[PDB]
């Protein structure tokens, strides 16, 4: 299994950004796909998940209203559209896959991450 994130970089506060995850080595349409992040001085935490049945789940506070998760099963890729970014959104963003979990950080498969910095 390989999960490859892309799209990270430097953005300014208030910007939008799209991250992508390209999956290989698994039957993509049978897995729940999730985005997690690890910001400076914080534990790795849930951002969003899209189940294999297409149901979307978002993390606490500034995720439901600002971010949107989607998947393209034909391309074995999933995306995170981030809006109204803030300096506290600076983090390494990770793609993950699991047949069962949604919010838990205990997903079976993980990518290496893509870094996002949001300047003040």
mmCIF file of N, CA and C in Angstrom:
data_model
loop_
_atom_site.group_PDB
_atom_site.id
_atom_site.type_symbol
_atom_site.label_atom_id
_atom_site.label_comp_id
_atom_site.label_asym_id
_atom_site.label_seq_id
_atom_site.Cartn_x
_atom_site.Cartn_y
_atom_site.Cartn_z
ATOM 1 N N UNK A 1 0.835 -1.213 0.000
ATOM 2 C CA UNK A 1 0.000 0.000 0.000
ATOM 3 C C UNK A 1 0.867 1.260 0.000
ATOM 4 N N UNK A 2 0.515 2.229 -0.854
ATOM 5 C CA UNK A 2 1.179 3.515 -0.887
ATOM 6 C C UNK A 2 0.143 4.628 -0.966
ATOM 7 N N UNK A 3 0.210 5.595 -0.036
ATOM 8 C CA UNK A 3 -0.644 6.775 -0.041
ATOM 9 C C UNK A 3 0.266 7.971 -0.218
ATOM 10 N N UNK A 4 0.063 8.759 -1.293
ATOM 11 C CA UNK A 4 0.959 9.886 -1.593
ATOM 12 C C UNK A 4 0.212 11.213 -1.574
ATOM 13 N N UNK A 5 0.528 12.059 -0.596
ATOM 14 C CA UNK A 5 -0.088 13.381 -0.514
ATOM 15 C C UNK A 5 0.659 14.360 -1.419
ATOM 16 N N UNK A 6 -0.080 15.350 -1.920
ATOM 17 C CA UNK A 6 0.501 16.460 -2.666
ATOM 18 C C UNK A 6 -0.326 17.723 -2.478
ATOM 19 N N UNK A 7 0.278 18.858 -2.807
ATOM 20 C CA UNK A 7 -0.398 20.145 -2.753
ATOM 21 C C UNK A 7 0.023 21.095 -1.653
ATOM 22 N N UNK A 8 0.879 20.638 -0.732
ATOM 23 C CA UNK A 8 1.334 21.494 0.353
ATOM 24 C C UNK A 8 2.249 22.624 -0.091
ATOM 25 N N UNK A 9 2.424 23.590 0.798
ATOM 26 C CA UNK A 9 3.314 24.721 0.563
ATOM 27 C C UNK A 9 3.005 25.855 1.504
ATOM 28 N N UNK A 10 3.349 27.062 1.080
ATOM 29 C CA UNK A 10 3.150 28.279 1.862
ATOM 30 C C UNK A 10 1.979 29.055 1.304
ATOM 31 N N UNK A 11 1.023 29.430 2.185
ATOM 32 C CA UNK A 11 -0.131 30.251 1.815
ATOM 33 C C UNK A 11 -0.269 31.381 2.833
ATOM 34 N N UNK A 12 -1.063 32.413 2.491
ATOM 35 C CA UNK A 12 -1.295 33.559 3.349
ATOM 36 C C UNK A 12 -2.645 33.378 4.058
ATOM 37 N N UNK A 13 -2.778 33.935 5.280
ATOM 38 C CA UNK A 13 -4.020 33.829 6.067
ATOM 39 C C UNK A 13 -5.205 34.328 5.225
ATOM 40 N N UNK A 14 -6.274 33.544 5.198
ATOM 41 C CA UNK A 14 -7.463 33.848 4.410
ATOM 42 C C UNK A 14 -7.541 33.085 3.101
ATOM 43 N N UNK A 15 -6.426 32.455 2.668
ATOM 44 C CA UNK A 15 -6.376 31.694 1.409
ATOM 45 C C UNK A 15 -7.098 30.358 1.458
ATOM 46 N N UNK A 16 -7.373 29.830 0.266
ATOM 47 C CA UNK A 16 -7.919 28.499 0.045
ATOM 48 C C UNK A 16 -6.776 27.656 -0.533
ATOM 49 N N UNK A 17 -6.861 26.341 -0.373
ATOM 50 C CA UNK A 17 -5.841 25.399 -0.804
ATOM 51 C C UNK A 17 -6.472 24.031 -1.002
ATOM 52 N N UNK A 18 -6.057 23.299 -2.053
ATOM 53 C CA UNK A 18 -6.545 21.940 -2.293
ATOM 54 C C UNK A 18 -5.385 20.954 -2.149
ATOM 55 N N UNK A 19 -5.575 19.936 -1.304
ATOM 56 C CA UNK A 19 -4.619 18.856 -1.105
ATOM 57 C C UNK A 19 -5.172 17.610 -1.786
ATOM 58 N N UNK A 20 -4.275 16.757 -2.284
ATOM 59 C CA UNK A 20 -4.696 15.525 -2.922
ATOM 60 C C UNK A 20 -3.953 14.327 -2.342
ATOM 61 N N UNK A 21 -4.574 13.156 -2.426
ATOM 62 C CA UNK A 21 -3.956 11.910 -1.999
ATOM 63 C C UNK A 21 -4.135 10.889 -3.084
ATOM 64 N N UNK A 22 -3.026 10.328 -3.608
ATOM 65 C CA UNK A 22 -3.059 9.298 -4.640
ATOM 66 C C UNK A 22 -2.751 7.943 -3.977
ATOM 67 N N UNK A 23 -3.671 6.983 -4.100
ATOM 68 C CA UNK A 23 -3.523 5.665 -3.479
ATOM 69 C C UNK A 23 -3.195 4.579 -4.487
ATOM 70 N N UNK A 24 -2.367 3.615 -4.074
ATOM 71 C CA UNK A 24 -2.061 2.434 -4.900
ATOM 72 C C UNK A 24 -1.810 1.217 -3.994
ATOM 73 N N UNK A 25 -1.914 0.008 -4.541
ATOM 74 C CA UNK A 25 -1.676 -1.194 -3.745
ATOM 75 C C UNK A 25 -2.836 -1.679 -2.886
ATOM 76 N N UNK A 26 -4.028 -1.082 -3.045
ATOM 77 C CA UNK A 26 -5.235 -1.554 -2.350
ATOM 78 C C UNK A 26 -6.448 -1.342 -3.235
ATOM 79 N N UNK A 27 -7.558 -2.012 -2.910
ATOM 80 C CA UNK A 27 -8.811 -1.852 -3.652
ATOM 81 C C UNK A 27 -9.467 -0.607 -3.072
ATOM 82 N N UNK A 28 -9.132 0.545 -3.661
ATOM 83 C CA UNK A 28 -9.530 1.871 -3.192
ATOM 84 C C UNK A 28 -10.998 2.034 -2.829
ATOM 85 N N UNK A 29 -11.923 1.529 -3.677
ATOM 86 C CA UNK A 29 -13.346 1.759 -3.414
ATOM 87 C C UNK A 29 -13.896 0.942 -2.225
ATOM 88 N N UNK A 30 -13.047 0.139 -1.541
ATOM 89 C CA UNK A 30 -13.480 -0.616 -0.357
ATOM 90 C C UNK A 30 -12.932 0.014 0.961
ATOM 91 N N UNK A 31 -12.291 1.179 0.853
ATOM 92 C CA UNK A 31 -11.689 1.832 2.001
ATOM 93 C C UNK A 31 -12.252 3.181 2.306
ATOM 94 N N UNK A 32 -12.418 3.441 3.608
ATOM 95 C CA UNK A 32 -12.715 4.777 4.123
ATOM 96 C C UNK A 32 -11.369 5.532 3.991
ATOM 97 N N UNK A 33 -11.425 6.790 3.563
ATOM 98 C CA UNK A 33 -10.222 7.603 3.347
ATOM 99 C C UNK A 33 -10.281 8.815 4.245
ATOM 100 N N UNK A 34 -9.202 9.066 4.979
ATOM 101 C CA UNK A 34 -9.218 10.177 5.918
ATOM 102 C C UNK A 34 -8.036 11.106 5.819
ATOM 103 N N UNK A 35 -8.247 12.344 6.264
ATOM 104 C CA UNK A 35 -7.193 13.358 6.394
ATOM 105 C C UNK A 35 -7.007 13.589 7.899
ATOM 106 N N UNK A 36 -5.713 13.622 8.331
ATOM 107 C CA UNK A 36 -5.330 13.918 9.704
ATOM 108 C C UNK A 36 -4.248 15.002 9.600
ATOM 109 N N UNK A 37 -3.950 15.647 10.707
ATOM 110 C CA UNK A 37 -2.868 16.642 10.701
ATOM 111 C C UNK A 37 -2.098 16.591 11.996
ATOM 112 N N UNK A 38 -0.884 17.107 11.954
ATOM 113 C CA UNK A 38 -0.075 17.275 13.149
ATOM 114 C C UNK A 38 0.535 18.676 13.082
ATOM 115 N N UNK A 39 0.017 19.556 13.945
ATOM 116 C CA UNK A 39 0.498 20.926 14.032
ATOM 117 C C UNK A 39 1.589 21.054 15.112
ATOM 118 N N UNK A 40 2.444 22.099 15.017
ATOM 119 C CA UNK A 40 3.430 22.346 16.090
ATOM 120 C C UNK A 40 2.822 22.301 17.506
ATOM 121 N N UNK A 41 3.436 21.501 18.381
ATOM 122 C CA UNK A 41 3.069 21.369 19.790
ATOM 123 C C UNK A 41 1.769 20.642 20.070
ATOM 124 N N UNK A 42 1.218 19.945 19.051
ATOM 125 C CA UNK A 42 -0.046 19.223 19.222
ATOM 126 C C UNK A 42 0.080 17.780 18.830
ATOM 127 N N UNK A 43 -0.847 16.952 19.341
ATOM 128 C CA UNK A 43 -0.911 15.551 18.961
ATOM 129 C C UNK A 43 -1.540 15.473 17.564
ATOM 130 N N UNK A 44 -1.249 14.379 16.829
ATOM 131 C CA UNK A 44 -1.874 14.115 15.536
ATOM 132 C C UNK A 44 -3.395 14.002 15.766
ATOM 133 N N UNK A 45 -4.175 14.669 14.913
ATOM 134 C CA UNK A 45 -5.623 14.732 15.104
ATOM 135 C C UNK A 45 -6.415 14.628 13.826
ATOM 136 N N UNK A 46 -7.654 14.190 13.992
ATOM 137 C CA UNK A 46 -8.595 14.018 12.919
ATOM 138 C C UNK A 46 -8.996 15.342 12.239
ATOM 139 N N UNK A 47 -9.064 15.344 10.885
ATOM 140 C CA UNK A 47 -9.559 16.513 10.132
ATOM 141 C C UNK A 47 -10.868 16.147 9.432
ATOM 142 N N UNK A 48 -10.855 15.084 8.597
ATOM 143 C CA UNK A 48 -12.073 14.694 7.855
ATOM 144 C C UNK A 48 -11.951 13.280 7.333
ATOM 145 N N UNK A 49 -13.101 12.628 7.064
ATOM 146 C CA UNK A 49 -13.076 11.293 6.481
ATOM 147 C C UNK A 49 -14.235 11.147 5.500
ATOM 148 N N UNK A 50 -14.015 10.328 4.476
ATOM 149 C CA UNK A 50 -15.051 9.999 3.498
ATOM 150 C C UNK A 50 -15.131 8.479 3.429
ATOM 151 N N UNK A 51 -16.288 7.928 3.831
ATOM 152 C CA UNK A 51 -16.411 6.475 3.840
ATOM 153 C C UNK A 51 -16.469 5.901 2.432
ATOM 154 N N UNK A 52 -16.262 4.578 2.302
ATOM 155 C CA UNK A 52 -16.379 3.987 0.975
ATOM 156 C C UNK A 52 -17.797 4.151 0.425
ATOM 157 N N UNK A 53 -18.799 4.348 1.309
ATOM 158 C CA UNK A 53 -20.168 4.589 0.852
ATOM 159 C C UNK A 53 -20.452 6.067 0.518
ATOM 160 N N UNK A 54 -19.436 6.928 0.685
ATOM 161 C CA UNK A 54 -19.533 8.339 0.348
ATOM 162 C C UNK A 54 -19.957 9.283 1.452
ATOM 163 N N UNK A 55 -20.117 8.785 2.680
ATOM 164 C CA UNK A 55 -20.536 9.650 3.783
ATOM 165 C C UNK A 55 -19.338 10.461 4.291
ATOM 166 N N UNK A 56 -19.537 11.776 4.461
ATOM 167 C CA UNK A 56 -18.449 12.672 4.909
ATOM 168 C C UNK A 56 -18.612 13.025 6.387
ATOM 169 N N UNK A 57 -17.481 12.992 7.133
ATOM 170 C CA UNK A 57 -17.423 13.303 8.555
ATOM 171 C C UNK A 57 -16.284 14.315 8.761
ATOM 172 N N UNK A 58 -16.525 15.342 9.594
ATOM 173 C CA UNK A 58 -15.544 16.388 9.851
ATOM 174 C C UNK A 58 -15.167 16.484 11.322
ATOM 175 N N UNK A 59 -13.948 16.931 11.560
ATOM 176 C CA UNK A 59 -13.411 17.145 12.896
ATOM 177 C C UNK A 59 -14.018 18.372 13.566
ATOM 178 N N UNK A 60 -13.555 18.681 14.778
ATOM 179 C CA UNK A 60 -14.106 19.762 15.591
ATOM 180 C C UNK A 60 -13.822 21.167 15.082
ATOM 181 N N UNK A 61 -14.786 22.049 15.396
ATOM 182 C CA UNK A 61 -14.887 23.485 15.187
ATOM 183 C C UNK A 61 -14.821 23.959 13.736
ATOM 184 N N UNK A 62 -13.638 24.388 13.327
ATOM 185 C CA UNK A 62 -13.365 25.039 12.066
ATOM 186 C C UNK A 62 -13.040 24.069 10.905
ATOM 187 N N UNK A 63 -13.789 22.956 10.805
ATOM 188 C CA UNK A 63 -13.596 21.973 9.732
ATOM 189 C C UNK A 63 -14.861 21.835 8.864
ATOM 190 N N UNK A 64 -16.039 21.585 9.483
ATOM 191 C CA UNK A 64 -17.326 21.417 8.782
ATOM 192 C C UNK A 64 -17.639 22.617 7.883
ATOM 193 N N UNK A 65 -17.460 23.816 8.432
ATOM 194 C CA UNK A 65 -17.745 25.056 7.729
ATOM 195 C C UNK A 65 -16.641 25.547 6.823
ATOM 196 N N UNK A 66 -15.388 25.063 7.016
ATOM 197 C CA UNK A 66 -14.297 25.567 6.189
ATOM 198 C C UNK A 66 -13.729 24.569 5.201
ATOM 199 N N UNK A 67 -13.764 23.263 5.522
ATOM 200 C CA UNK A 67 -13.127 22.246 4.675
ATOM 201 C C UNK A 67 -14.127 21.303 4.036
ATOM 202 N N UNK A 68 -13.758 20.741 2.872
ATOM 203 C CA UNK A 68 -14.617 19.774 2.194
ATOM 204 C C UNK A 68 -13.778 18.617 1.673
ATOM 205 N N UNK A 69 -14.218 17.393 1.960
ATOM 206 C CA UNK A 69 -13.512 16.189 1.534
ATOM 207 C C UNK A 69 -14.314 15.535 0.398
ATOM 208 N N UNK A 70 -13.595 14.954 -0.556
ATOM 209 C CA UNK A 70 -14.224 14.258 -1.681
ATOM 210 C C UNK A 70 -13.308 13.140 -2.171
ATOM 211 N N UNK A 71 -13.848 12.223 -2.966
ATOM 212 C CA UNK A 71 -13.050 11.139 -3.539
ATOM 213 C C UNK A 71 -13.436 10.908 -5.003
ATOM 214 N N UNK A 72 -12.468 10.428 -5.803
ATOM 215 C CA UNK A 72 -12.700 10.083 -7.204
ATOM 216 C C UNK A 72 -12.221 8.650 -7.331
ATOM 217 N N UNK A 73 -13.159 7.706 -7.232
ATOM 218 C CA UNK A 73 -12.801 6.295 -7.243
ATOM 219 C C UNK A 73 -12.135 5.842 -8.534
ATOM 220 N N UNK A 74 -12.499 6.455 -9.687
ATOM 221 C CA UNK A 74 -11.906 6.107 -10.993
ATOM 222 C C UNK A 74 -10.416 6.458 -11.034
ATOM 223 N N UNK A 75 -10.010 7.509 -10.313
ATOM 224 C CA UNK A 75 -8.616 7.947 -10.281
ATOM 225 C C UNK A 75 -7.868 7.434 -9.039
ATOM 226 N N UNK A 76 -8.563 6.722 -8.098
ATOM 227 C CA UNK A 76 -7.946 6.249 -6.834
ATOM 228 C C UNK A 76 -7.298 7.428 -6.097
ATOM 229 N N UNK A 77 -8.004 8.564 -6.083
ATOM 230 C CA UNK A 77 -7.520 9.777 -5.448
ATOM 231 C C UNK A 77 -8.622 10.365 -4.582
ATOM 232 N N UNK A 78 -8.214 11.049 -3.522
ATOM 233 C CA UNK A 78 -9.142 11.764 -2.655
ATOM 234 C C UNK A 78 -8.581 13.158 -2.374
ATOM 235 N N UNK A 79 -9.456 14.105 -2.041
ATOM 236 C CA UNK A 79 -9.054 15.496 -1.896
ATOM 237 C C UNK A 79 -9.539 16.173 -0.637
ATOM 238 N N UNK A 80 -8.803 17.220 -0.225
ATOM 239 C CA UNK A 80 -9.223 18.095 0.854
ATOM 240 C C UNK A 80 -9.199 19.530 0.333
ATOM 241 N N UNK A 81 -10.379 20.155 0.250
ATOM 242 C CA UNK A 81 -10.476 21.562 -0.144
ATOM 243 C C UNK A 81 -10.512 22.345 1.161
ATOM 244 N N UNK A 82 -9.501 23.189 1.406
ATOM 245 C CA UNK A 82 -9.449 24.001 2.627
ATOM 246 C C UNK A 82 -9.727 25.468 2.285
ATOM 247 N N UNK A 83 -10.594 26.137 3.061
ATOM 248 C CA UNK A 83 -10.923 27.543 2.862
ATOM 249 C C UNK A 83 -10.654 28.338 4.142
ATOM 250 N N UNK A 84 -10.569 29.686 4.028
ATOM 251 C CA UNK A 84 -10.391 30.610 5.157
ATOM 252 C C UNK A 84 -9.285 30.129 6.117
ATOM 253 N N UNK A 85 -8.137 29.772 5.542
ATOM 254 C CA UNK A 85 -7.013 29.261 6.327
ATOM 255 C C UNK A 85 -6.463 30.296 7.304
ATOM 256 N N UNK A 86 -5.993 29.803 8.453
ATOM 257 C CA UNK A 86 -5.453 30.614 9.541
ATOM 258 C C UNK A 86 -4.071 30.105 9.945
ATOM 259 N N UNK A 87 -3.241 30.938 10.614
ATOM 260 C CA UNK A 87 -1.903 30.464 11.029
ATOM 261 C C UNK A 87 -1.954 29.150 11.831
ATOM 262 N N UNK A 88 -3.002 28.945 12.676
ATOM 263 C CA UNK A 88 -3.137 27.710 13.462
ATOM 264 C C UNK A 88 -3.396 26.450 12.596
ATOM 265 N N UNK A 89 -3.664 26.616 11.280
ATOM 266 C CA UNK A 89 -3.823 25.501 10.331
ATOM 267 C C UNK A 89 -2.449 24.998 9.828
ATOM 268 N N UNK A 90 -1.351 25.687 10.203
ATOM 269 C CA UNK A 90 0.007 25.232 9.852
ATOM 270 C C UNK A 90 0.228 23.846 10.459
ATOM 271 N N UNK A 91 0.548 22.866 9.609
ATOM 272 C CA UNK A 91 0.674 21.471 10.069
ATOM 273 C C UNK A 91 1.141 20.599 8.940
ATOM 274 N N UNK A 92 1.543 19.360 9.278
ATOM 275 C CA UNK A 92 1.753 18.330 8.280
ATOM 276 C C UNK A 92 0.377 17.642 8.150
ATOM 277 N N UNK A 93 -0.109 17.534 6.918
ATOM 278 C CA UNK A 93 -1.395 16.894 6.603
ATOM 279 C C UNK A 93 -1.139 15.508 6.036
ATOM 280 N N UNK A 94 -1.800 14.493 6.636
ATOM 281 C CA UNK A 94 -1.608 13.089 6.280
ATOM 282 C C UNK A 94 -2.877 12.481 5.700
ATOM 283 N N UNK A 95 -2.674 11.664 4.654
ATOM 284 C CA UNK A 95 -3.714 10.817 4.034
ATOM 285 C C UNK A 95 -3.676 9.473 4.794
ATOM 286 N N UNK A 96 -4.854 8.872 5.030
ATOM 287 C CA UNK A 96 -4.891 7.547 5.654
ATOM 288 C C UNK A 96 -6.047 6.706 5.103
ATOM 289 N N UNK A 97 -5.887 5.377 5.131
ATOM 290 C CA UNK A 97 -6.930 4.455 4.628
ATOM 291 C C UNK A 97 -7.254 3.367 5.651
ATOM 292 N N UNK A 98 -8.543 2.984 5.750
ATOM 293 C CA UNK A 98 -8.965 1.931 6.672
ATOM 294 C C UNK A 98 -10.310 1.403 6.204
ATOM 295 N N UNK A 99 -10.529 0.098 6.314
ATOM 296 C CA UNK A 99 -11.823 -0.459 5.897
ATOM 297 C C UNK A 99 -12.974 -0.106 6.867
ATOM 298 N N UNK A 100 -12.665 0.289 8.120
ATOM 299 C CA UNK A 100 -13.735 0.454 9.114
ATOM 300 C C UNK A 100 -13.803 1.764 9.851
ATOM 301 N N UNK A 101 -12.644 2.334 10.200
ATOM 302 C CA UNK A 101 -12.624 3.517 11.032
ATOM 303 C C UNK A 101 -13.020 4.807 10.326
ATOM 304 N N UNK A 102 -13.424 5.800 11.116
ATOM 305 C CA UNK A 102 -13.798 7.124 10.594
ATOM 306 C C UNK A 102 -13.006 8.213 11.306
ATOM 307 N N UNK A 103 -13.313 8.456 12.601
ATOM 308 C CA UNK A 103 -12.656 9.530 13.364
ATOM 309 C C UNK A 103 -11.365 9.104 14.048
ATOM 310 N N UNK A 104 -11.248 7.808 14.406
ATOM 311 C CA UNK A 104 -10.093 7.298 15.146
ATOM 312 C C UNK A 104 -8.774 7.538 14.410
ATOM 313 N N UNK A 105 -7.701 7.834 15.160
ATOM 314 C CA UNK A 105 -6.375 7.981 14.545
ATOM 315 C C UNK A 105 -5.747 6.605 14.227
ATOM 316 N N UNK A 106 -6.424 5.508 14.600
ATOM 317 C CA UNK A 106 -5.876 4.152 14.470
ATOM 318 C C UNK A 106 -6.060 3.515 13.067
ATOM 319 N N UNK A 107 -6.123 4.332 11.989
ATOM 320 C CA UNK A 107 -6.232 3.788 10.620
ATOM 321 C C UNK A 107 -5.048 2.864 10.314
ATOM 322 N N UNK A 108 -5.298 1.814 9.519
ATOM 323 C CA UNK A 108 -4.229 0.861 9.160
ATOM 324 C C UNK A 108 -3.111 1.404 8.285
ATOM 325 N N UNK A 109 -3.444 2.260 7.295
ATOM 326 C CA UNK A 109 -2.458 2.758 6.318
ATOM 327 C C UNK A 109 -2.324 4.252 6.322
ATOM 328 N N UNK A 110 -1.084 4.730 6.168
ATOM 329 C CA UNK A 110 -0.749 6.133 6.244
ATOM 330 C C UNK A 110 0.227 6.566 5.180
ATOM 331 N N UNK A 111 0.050 7.802 4.719
ATOM 332 C CA UNK A 111 1.040 8.452 3.868
ATOM 333 C C UNK A 111 2.089 9.144 4.734
ATOM 334 N N UNK A 112 3.117 9.718 4.095
ATOM 335 C CA UNK A 112 4.204 10.399 4.814
ATOM 336 C C UNK A 112 3.905 11.867 5.137
ATOM 337 N N UNK A 113 2.866 12.409 4.516
ATOM 338 C CA UNK A 113 2.420 13.770 4.763
ATOM 339 C C UNK A 113 2.878 14.825 3.793
ATOM 340 N N UNK A 114 2.110 15.925 3.742
ATOM 341 C CA UNK A 114 2.473 17.132 2.962
ATOM 342 C C UNK A 114 2.343 18.317 3.907
ATOM 343 N N UNK A 115 3.382 19.173 3.959
ATOM 344 C CA UNK A 115 3.374 20.287 4.887
ATOM 345 C C UNK A 115 2.664 21.533 4.348
ATOM 346 N N UNK A 116 1.861 22.158 5.206
ATOM 347 C CA UNK A 116 1.203 23.420 4.867
ATOM 348 C C UNK A 116 1.600 24.466 5.898
ATOM 349 N N UNK A 117 2.100 25.643 5.455
ATOM 350 C CA UNK A 117 2.336 26.784 6.336
ATOM 351 C C UNK A 117 1.392 27.913 5.942
ATOM 352 N N UNK A 118 0.709 28.506 6.941
ATOM 353 C CA UNK A 118 -0.192 29.639 6.727
ATOM 354 C C UNK A 118 0.432 30.791 7.493
ATOM 355 N N UNK A 119 0.911 31.810 6.767
ATOM 356 C CA UNK A 119 1.556 32.963 7.391
ATOM 357 C C UNK A 119 0.535 33.965 7.932
ATOM 358 N N UNK A 120 0.941 34.762 8.933
ATOM 359 C CA UNK A 120 0.094 35.807 9.512
ATOM 360 C C UNK A 120 0.256 37.082 8.684
#
